[PDB]
């Protein structure tokens, strides 16, 4: 139950993190359980959400466990809750602009 605030447009870096340093598979979903952003091996993938063109991630940090989510062009309608599922640690971070 983390708290993250933005203004508008800016890049927020939500973060889930494991303890392995070996690029394990994660995902990122929202409150309606639609995929936001996902890892598939060594490639990135999106999901058919309404953040599909705006979401991003930092590719070089996956090899150290850190699996961020970087969102551009913050509207008002993305003020929701987001869920990172590494292997079990379904951490929820909520967002507001």
């Amino acid at each position: 139950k983390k708290v993250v605030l933005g203004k508008k447009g800016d890049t927020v870096e939500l973060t889930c993190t494991a303890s392995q340093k070996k690029s394990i598979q994660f995902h990122w979903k929202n409150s309606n359980q639609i995929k936001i952003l996902g890892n598939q091996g060594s490639f990135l993938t999106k999901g058919p959400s309404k953040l599909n063109d705006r979401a991003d991630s930092r590719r070089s940090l996956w090899d150290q466990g850190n699996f961020p989510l970087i969102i551009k062009n913050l509207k008002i309608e993305d003020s929701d809750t987001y869920i990172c599922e590494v292997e079990d640690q379904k951490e929820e971070v909520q967002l507001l602009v």
Partner: protein
């Protein structure tokens, strides 16, 4: 001579995590870059594989926690690193908020070399055995009803593709919908075929502009086969519609195989587009020289493409989908890219166990 015996030769097995060895059928004079690797890293396959069928045995297989998937995935990274040497290899290093991540650029001698995969076996060592689920309806997990023992599995071709599991092996009953847990929207639904939908990929005489022709007849009935046994998982009222990929990296939003050393990128957009109430299509394929490596996190940059025709006929014997959790209609926009799924979908019916042939039991001696 009273009450505790020992026997040597009891049929007991406990599951293990050994190191299997390759054992492929290499040719040792070719310079096709698999027969080079399979010469100095494998043994010749045995002519007579002794296969003992087990009777009235119910082993509890698993494929989403299999280990020999990992020993394949390390041998195949070791294959590609000695076969397809890139001219420029841009792998990061990354040695808080932002740790120092320098992106090193190893360059090396990079000729063009022939590259078509051969079937690799995987033979267990002495004192172990490989169990094999001979049931033709296996869900992937759970108690397999019929098991057989075998030194190694069938000749597995280490192809590498996303969105489509080409040249692979094919099911026998109708089409299997193997996954881990279909409520999650985060596990790749593997799908096998019982029919090889052929695909004809060519570069004719732009040198980076190809096309791949797949029949509308064979693809409409094979999408017809899959769509029946999905409403047996999500209810008979869901009007499930296939769809385009959702976005993301270029190697997973497009059918990224390779052929003859050259890394094609097709466009399966007219291939998954059909709603389903309860001739040959063409695919706009490119050839990239700047690919993302699937081995590690990196980027490679290869030589210019070769001159000539590059015809690449292959069997689509598998899909990898991904469901979409709606509010309702379940849309299956495909995916892939984790290369362990091309080897989970061909090492699912296997399990390596450790034979412990010593046993105790009481009687009256």
């Amino acid at each position: 001579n009273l009450w505790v015996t020992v026997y040597y030769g009891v049929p007991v097995w406990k599951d293990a995590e050994t190191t299997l060895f390759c054992a492929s059928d290499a040719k040792a004079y070719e310079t096709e870059k698999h027969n080079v690797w399979a010469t100095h890293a494998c043994v010749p396959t045995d002519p007579n594989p002794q296969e003992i069928h087990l009777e009235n045995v119910t082993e509890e297989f698993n494929m989403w926690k299999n280990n020999m998937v990992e020993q394949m995935h390390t041998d195949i990274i070791s294959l590609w690193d000695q076969s397809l040497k890139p001219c420029v290899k841009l792998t990061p290093l990354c040695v808080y908020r932002l740790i120092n991540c320098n992106t090193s650029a190893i360059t090396q001698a990079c000729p063009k070399v022939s590259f078509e995969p051969i079937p690799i076996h995987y033979c267990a060592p002495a004192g172990f055995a490989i169990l094999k689920c001979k049931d033709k309806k296996f869900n992937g997990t759970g108690p397999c009803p019929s098991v057989s023992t075998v030194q190694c599995t069938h000749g597995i071709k280490p192809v590498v593709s996303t969105q489509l599991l080409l040249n692979g092996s094919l099911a026998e009953e109708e089409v299997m919908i193997r996954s881990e847990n279909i409520t999650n929207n985060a596990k790749n639904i593997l799908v096998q075929f019982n029919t090889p939908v052929q695909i004809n990929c060519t570069r004719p005489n732009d040198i980076r502009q190809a096309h791949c022709n797949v029949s509308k007849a064979t693809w409409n009935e094979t999408l017809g086969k899959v769509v029946k046994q999905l409403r047996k998982h999500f209810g008979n009222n869901t009007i499930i519609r296939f769809a385009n990929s959702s976005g993301g990296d270029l190697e997973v939003t497009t059918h990224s195989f390779n052929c003859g050393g050259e890394f094609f990128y097709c466009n399966t957009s007219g291939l998954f587009n059909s709603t389903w109430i309860s001739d040959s299509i063409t695919l706009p394929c490119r050839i990239k020289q700047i690919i993302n490596m699937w081995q590690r996190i990196g980027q490679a940059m290869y030589a210019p493409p070769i001159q000539g025709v590059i015809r690449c006929v292959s069997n689509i014997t598998g899909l990898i989908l991904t469901r979409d959790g709606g509010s309702t209609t379940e849309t299956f926009r495909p995916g892939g890219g984790d290369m362990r799924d091309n080897w989970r979908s061909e090492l699912y019916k296997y399990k390596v166990v450790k034979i412990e042939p010593l046993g105790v039991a009481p009687t009256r001696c």
